[PDB]
Predict the 3D structure of the following.
Amino acid sequence: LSAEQSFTLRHPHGQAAALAFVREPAAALAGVQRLRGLDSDGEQVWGELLVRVPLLGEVDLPFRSEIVRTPQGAELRPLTLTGERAWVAVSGQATAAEGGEMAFAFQFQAHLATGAAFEVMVQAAAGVTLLLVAMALPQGLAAGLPPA
Amino acid sequence: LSAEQSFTLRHPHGQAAALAFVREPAAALAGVQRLRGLDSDGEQVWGELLVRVPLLGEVDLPFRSEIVRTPQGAELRPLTLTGERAWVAVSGQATAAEGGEMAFAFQFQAHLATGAAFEVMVQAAAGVTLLLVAMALPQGLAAGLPPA
Amino acid sequence: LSAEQSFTLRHPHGQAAALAFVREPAAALAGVQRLRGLDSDGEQVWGELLVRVPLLGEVDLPFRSEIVRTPQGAELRPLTLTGERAWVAVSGQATAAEGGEMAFAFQFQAHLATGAAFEVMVQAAAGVTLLLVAMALPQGLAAGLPPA
Amino acid sequence: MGDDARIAAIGDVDELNSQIGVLLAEPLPDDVRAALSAIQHDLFDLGGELCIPGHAAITEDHLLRLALWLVHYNGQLPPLEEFILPGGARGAALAHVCRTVCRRAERSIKALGASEPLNIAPAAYVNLLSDLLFVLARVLNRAAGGADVLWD
Amino acid sequence: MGDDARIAAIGDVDELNSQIGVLLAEPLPDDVRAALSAIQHDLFDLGGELCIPGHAAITEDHLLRLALWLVHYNGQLPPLEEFILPGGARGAALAHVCRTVCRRAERSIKALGASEPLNIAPAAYVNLLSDLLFVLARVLNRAAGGADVLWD
Amino acid sequence: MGDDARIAAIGDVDELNSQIGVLLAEPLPDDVRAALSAIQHDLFDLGGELCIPGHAAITEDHLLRLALWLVHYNGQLPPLEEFILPGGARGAALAHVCRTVCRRAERSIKALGASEPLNIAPAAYVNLLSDLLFVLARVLNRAAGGADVLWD
């Protein structure tokens, strides 16, 4: 019920641009897949991940995170959502260094609402959802970068 | 995966008012519970029912129905939604007669997306959802009616 | 050695009349049976219940209760009598509501004075006495009501 | 009006008496059997009183006998420790069914007395009988070597 | 209104049919078993007639068959010597319960016919059935080698 | 008014619970016994909700459990081939009686909700329970090595 991803990417336009890129979600997450309904007001970012199970099909789990501007970049810090339905906590940290070198780390946690055989289908499905989004992040972040 | 409900209610203001009431969703469904996100543009009505399962919690199943004006009242006729996720078909027929006597019939069908032990949790849960909304309809429809 | 009774009755003349009826014992208890020697001075009500046992025949157990006027009606609150002979505590609460709807609750407790085989005859007899009076109360209270 | 109020009460007393007949087809403690059989005669007379105008059959003596059985059987059982669920040995379970049908008859008898002049003895009789059937159910579970079914 | 009057009658017929199912789970004379099983089908059809408007199922033939069974079983029993109390062999006791539930259904069917147009066959059917269940109870006590329970 | 509407509903739930107690006195599949026993506790709580104002006890969890049992036992039976008559093994026959008494309680609960504010859970619970008792009857006929009684 957790997934982690970390990676580095170089911004072709250098440090100032890399700082600006990681600090604005609409830029950094423009090409990110598997985060449906992604939106932001500049203060928080929100959306949903899709957990596919039989018969119900695609079940959406919301997340909402606070955008925190830091000296070397920015973070997403997750907000707690209600227990009425399953949700996801999306955390991330990004830094931009000399020459436009960027480092990213993302963490995801699925929070389930509180029969034994069924629990197995939901846990497995949610695990797959978390890994799919985590594993595709480097590709997604790279897709947001412009050419030199 | 089906639920049905039928009942009669008298509109305190007589026939013309009863016809107007059944023909405008925002009036007829104002106090209806268990239909989350209910909305309409005058042509169609849409919303979602909540199926609660373990770990995923509240899973929303959308519906969308066409509003059809008839000589004695109005109907809702369900639109087919995609198979990517579970959905619901909501149908209904309403008539208004002399003196403001109103007759209602509603039908609900849950359409599941296409492991044996798990299917049992989803079918049971969806069945409970359909019955809860169906059984509460008379109360909900009555809550929309004004005093004489 | 306890008996309870609760019931509702409508006063045909409406609320003011129902309030007046429950607040005056001579009105409320006019047709009440199994309360021998019933009398009142407006402040307290008193009388006796009859416990029938072999050879002694009808043995009278006194009660005396305070009349308490309340915002919705009145109560009887029992007074403690001496232990020299068996007695009864008679409690009751009455309310009158909109339209003359009246609610009654009565409670009876027999208090015995302080051989094993004999105790069985007295307890059984006293129990029958309490139930007979309690079970007949709705009939008795209804007998005191006038026609519309 | 009265026929529905009266005919219905008579029918429920009859139904109750029939349920007791089913209970009597089960193995029972000799004392319990004697009490139940006598009650059947009482119920037959009770039904007759409800039916015929100006005719009475249930007296203080009938009520006294029920009071006596209640005291007796109750003093033969341990105190109630928790709410009981109807069930246990088949005999006990049937006694509980009789108990609920007796309460149903009491409701009909009370309704009848509200629309027609009726002595108080009939309702007082079934009021006691319902309580006795509850007690007898406990006695039968006891006699079966079992115990009452308790709730959460 | 009609639903309560109609839905209630249907339910009581269903309850009666179920009680007969319980009686059929007991050992019975082959002839008695055959009659009761056929009656279950009749009651299923009767319930359908009460439910569907413009639909009838109970005919003179149904009534005639009941009349025939009454004459038959009665001429197979000694004359009634005194009022009978419901009870005896378990089979007989259950038959009496069926009898009282049938009378309960008859009351509901009569109420229904008072608020809605209904053929007379349904009430005439259960009127006869109640009498037949009384007779069959006596037959079962007889078949059990026992006798009917008499009153004081 | 409310007392009749309310006291009657409480009584029917009690009667139903008692009939289930009788069914529990019969030999049953361990799983079926576990479900029925749990239901008795549910019915006790349900009666309490009907009685006390401002008090609720039946929740979605209760409904969900019934839905689960329905899906489970139904997927353990062959598809319905024709209308069924209440009867078969004694256990099955009793289950059908419970089914009809549960429907009777549902009618009373529906009547109560029409004259007083009441949550929807109680009627939804017994609506499901009636269907489950029908299913359990089929399971019991199956478990007895027999089959359901079919109509003409």
The two ends of chain D are 43 Å apart (CA to CA). The longest strand of chain D covers residues 84-85. Chains D and B do not touch (no CB pair under 8 Å). The longest helix of chain D spans residues 90-115.
